[PDB]
Amino acid sequence: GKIRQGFIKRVARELVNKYPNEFTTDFEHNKKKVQELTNVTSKKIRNRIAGYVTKLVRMKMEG
């Protein structure tokens, strides 16, 4: 199944709260921003974080 892992759900919300403006719907921009704003060495989990923060950014402007 494709249930997103909890720790990424945690860090994604945190990075959402502290820079609400530094992440936009563009996937790749968010990918780079989380690349540099964290110390992740596994590119895959970086992509996971990017994919989820995309969805959170989408969630924002409708509510």
Add this chain to the structure above:
Amino acid sequence: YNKRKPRKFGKGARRCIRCGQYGPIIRIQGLMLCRHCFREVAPKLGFRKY
């Protein structure tokens, strides 16, 4: 008359250094060790799991 006869072939010619087992002694490039001994020492030889 107590010395064991020389043997260049066969199982009796071969004996593990560690435990002395006459049987399974793998010889990939000349380990000279019993097979069961190999399990507890393979990482010490550098072998990994993949």
Add this chain to the structure above:
Amino acid sequence: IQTTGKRKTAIARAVIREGKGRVRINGKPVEIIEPEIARFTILEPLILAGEEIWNSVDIDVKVEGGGFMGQAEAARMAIARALVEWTGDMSLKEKFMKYDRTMLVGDPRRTEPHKPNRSTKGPRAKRQ
């Protein structure tokens, strides 16, 4: 023009230049390959392409590895890419992908490793 082709374990290197139309596998005419199924497999890309492309270019392809059928399919992929790069027109690409997919996508499938408990008969094989 240079092209390559991957399939199973038969890998083909192909070079296409201007010529009368001769097409050679390992420097041998494509019409005299002993298996006929391999002949059609090698031949598939230039039937539907047309006769003018057939007689307007000389193509030399060398295939190493795998089986004869795999060699045929790798030569098919190589010659397909050869016509692709030599002609460089969209319509041939469209009809290439319409007839099938392999010659523009390859077959990246391989043979999975064998696993113990009667590994010899196959990976997923076991005893009774």
Add this chain to the structure above:
Amino acid sequence: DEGYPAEVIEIIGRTGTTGDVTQVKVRILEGRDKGRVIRRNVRGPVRIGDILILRETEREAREIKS
């Protein structure tokens, strides 16, 4: 061969003991009951809009009891 083809529309759900029988709704495309919708079963894979051949239109399957 007195058969009657009919067109699948909606799939009620996997039925039978093992779920290998699939319950669908079919519209009779030809015959004495033209246009009539019947709940009919399908062994083997089926989709929407398949033409299934009937020997008897009168036979029907009971509603799937959950």
Add this chain to the structure above:
Amino acid sequence: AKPLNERFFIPHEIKVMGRWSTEDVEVRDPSLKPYINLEPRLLPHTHGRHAKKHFGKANVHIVERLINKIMRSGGSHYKVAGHFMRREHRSLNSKKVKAYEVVKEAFKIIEQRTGKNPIQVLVWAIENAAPREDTTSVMFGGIRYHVAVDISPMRRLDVALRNIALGASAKCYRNKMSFAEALAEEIILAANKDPKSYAYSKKLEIERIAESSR
């Protein structure tokens, strides 16, 4: 090699196998029209990812499927009338070139003996050998009962085509009469609804029993 080269060159104008361009073929049964693949292709083999596709079987050419269920025809729990139908001498499995050759020969036999499109003969046989009712044991509270069930077009195709293959194997197995001759004879019998064929016979058997399970 002269027949080999001439058969290489003849389908240069896009023909299934060597001959028998598929435009002239007509499917009479409405059920199997959107499933029988009539795309014109020179060679009936794609090595495709059809198994991993739920509905990718409709794309496979009927002749490729024919070679497919020919190569698998050997050995089974089917002790039909107490026989073990195994290929011990260079079995058909994985030797798709030999199977390719045998379908080529049987197609030539069909062409000559019937004087018409062998693909169309096969189409008629497929229509004529597909059953239209099976039986399923459905229970309520552990009281099982046999209920007639309608067959999907694709399952009908599968069972009928397996049946003709098994008829061919029953004919050739343990006889002087070759496999190509067996397949040609079986397909011509099934084409004209001949009960002598295994395919039409077992279509009738599948229709029956389910006939009485109402």
Add this chain to the structure above:
Amino acid sequence: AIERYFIREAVREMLIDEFLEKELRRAGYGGLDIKKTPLGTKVIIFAANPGYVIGRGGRRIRELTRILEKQFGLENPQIEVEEIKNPYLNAKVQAVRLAQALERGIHFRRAAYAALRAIMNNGARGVEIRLSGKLTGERAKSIRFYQGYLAKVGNPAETLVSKGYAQALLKLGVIGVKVAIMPPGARLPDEIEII
């Protein structure tokens, strides 16, 4: 044969390791390293205390300096003995120490818990101690005392953790001890830090 050479060198190495384990058990022999050079073969022995290794006036190590040249055939063995930076970070050395403590008629619970505390305040992230055998009677038992974070699977378990197995001898028989020590410097893959 480069293979036959590397395997030969590492076989010499682990045989020396086992020989020193059965020689230097009282010394808390923790680690080994070997450097070849035209001058000779330098052996680098990290022990819980080199004071016992040096012996009396070097009469101990000199014996070893003979031994490393005769049974293993090392040309010019030069012995160097050093201290482990934190023996509480070596599960092997801690295991040997606790086995020796148990052998001294010390109660298994009290010794194990004191050792656990002593390794913990030394900064080890996570400590597990498993004790098996005749611990309170003829029928054997296995009891595990854990504390902290001890990821027990994955590559990190095979990489960052320090592991130690020991056997302790007593009148009733043999007791098996296993010790797992997480050094603090390691970090988890799922731990993501933020700036």
Add this chain to the structure above:
Amino acid sequence: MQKARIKIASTNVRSLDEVANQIKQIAERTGVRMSGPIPLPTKRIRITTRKSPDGEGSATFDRWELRVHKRLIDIEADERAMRQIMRIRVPEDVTIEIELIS
């Protein structure tokens, strides 16, 4: 023209890359042409063995691997360039073998 062929082998990849990097710095510092390090095929020694010590249980087998990577560096003759390679600190795992070819 005279050349020196050097083969550097190690189980550790990082030790091998460090040795190659310092060789490269030496060769470019002495201003002597060097053929780029060609990574030759890595040897995979494989040993499988049954897990169970005795004969009991399911047929279980364990796989043990040794990946040893070797690289080839060819340099042109310069005695100054060859003087600095014997001073290269070589790790205990890396084996460097040097031959001279005309």
Add this chain to the structure above:
Amino acid sequence: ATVYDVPGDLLVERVAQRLKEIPEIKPPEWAPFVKTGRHKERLPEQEDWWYYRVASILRRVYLDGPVGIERLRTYYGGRKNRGHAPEKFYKAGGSIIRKALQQLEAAGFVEKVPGKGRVITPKGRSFLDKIATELKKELEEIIPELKK
């Protein structure tokens, strides 16, 4: 044209029937009573079986260049029935091909390069490509596509 432009079987047949003429090629006295290889289980059916071998062997020299006894053994080898054990692959005989190569050498179509094997002389190449041109022309007016 070259041998590459024709089937191998026909070219072997043509070279065998043509080398039937030359007095150099002559089966030895032990040949008819000795099969081709150890792996073979039945004697060769026909009596031209010697000539075909030469027509094969020389053809191999047209392609593999320097080839000695052992590699020609390797190519000719085949599967053998071992009884209740599985069938296994084995090699063919050696003295037969050694005598064939010696007869070719005395004929001047092949020479010996020591340490590498035996190579094909210019005369053998000219004969083989003349045969190939003739056969290519034959299958050309049989199959016009070969004029391409």
Add this chain to the structure above:
RNA sequence: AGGAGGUGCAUGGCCGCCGUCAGCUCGUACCGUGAGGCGUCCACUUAAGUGUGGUAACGAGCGAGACCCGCGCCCCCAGUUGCCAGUCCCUCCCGCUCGGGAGGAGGCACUCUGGGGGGACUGCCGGCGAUAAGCCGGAGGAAGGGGCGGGCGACGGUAGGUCAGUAUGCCCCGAAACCCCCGGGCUACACGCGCGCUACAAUGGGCGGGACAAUGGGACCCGACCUCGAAAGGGGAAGGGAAUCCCCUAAACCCGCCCUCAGUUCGGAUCGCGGGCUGCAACUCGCCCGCGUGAAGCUGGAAUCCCUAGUACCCGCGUGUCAUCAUCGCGC
């Protein structure tokens, strides 16, 4: 001392299955006098105690997952792996003079080689799902919805087994239950059952032809090449301590001829002879070279095992201990 003498309810360690199943629990809070319970429960969803949404609990730890190996495309770097990639030049074989083929120099394309980076992320759309989690379909694309083959198997239990590989309590023997040596046994056979190899011929056998692999190994070793013997084998020998010399042939495949279906132009068990290899010696106790002979079996009931994508099935190959014992195991 030694025990291969026993003692696996005397043990350590180890392996198996429950079971890579989803579980095991702890800190404090809450209910119950207590046994103990909660967290770990319920609707949905996941391959999971993975989560979603409500819960007297909130967090934590072990577990799955993440983690690591390899396939899937490209890029870079590196090119002595490999090639008339473009190729003036030299050597050669033909040819319709149209052309086709091969090597030395030279080039490094491309395969390969082996280090790093990108790329695949429900990344977007439609439908579902309470708008949540998440699910299905679609688009693009070498590969999207645990991408794919694997490794990492928990708290505990089974006195499972293993002290006969190792340490090892208890007891037993101390010129035997200790040490050495010769021969036999480890193969003994009217028998029941398990697992594997051959076979039950025409789909096929004989003759010859063609294009096809990785696994790994190679110094008393791998061995081209040359010579004798039909062959097993005898004698010499290049190169090689491993992208460079050998194992290296590919098999299946089809192609032209012979045979024309039967216990046999299948099948070889099995019985004897001459020769050959390892070993001190191979009848007990090896295989191979040739001959003669060369069995049943003709598809096999009751009962019953496994598999789902390159996967079944079929084919063929290196290697494990190693002269051979394997008709085995792993890997290709």
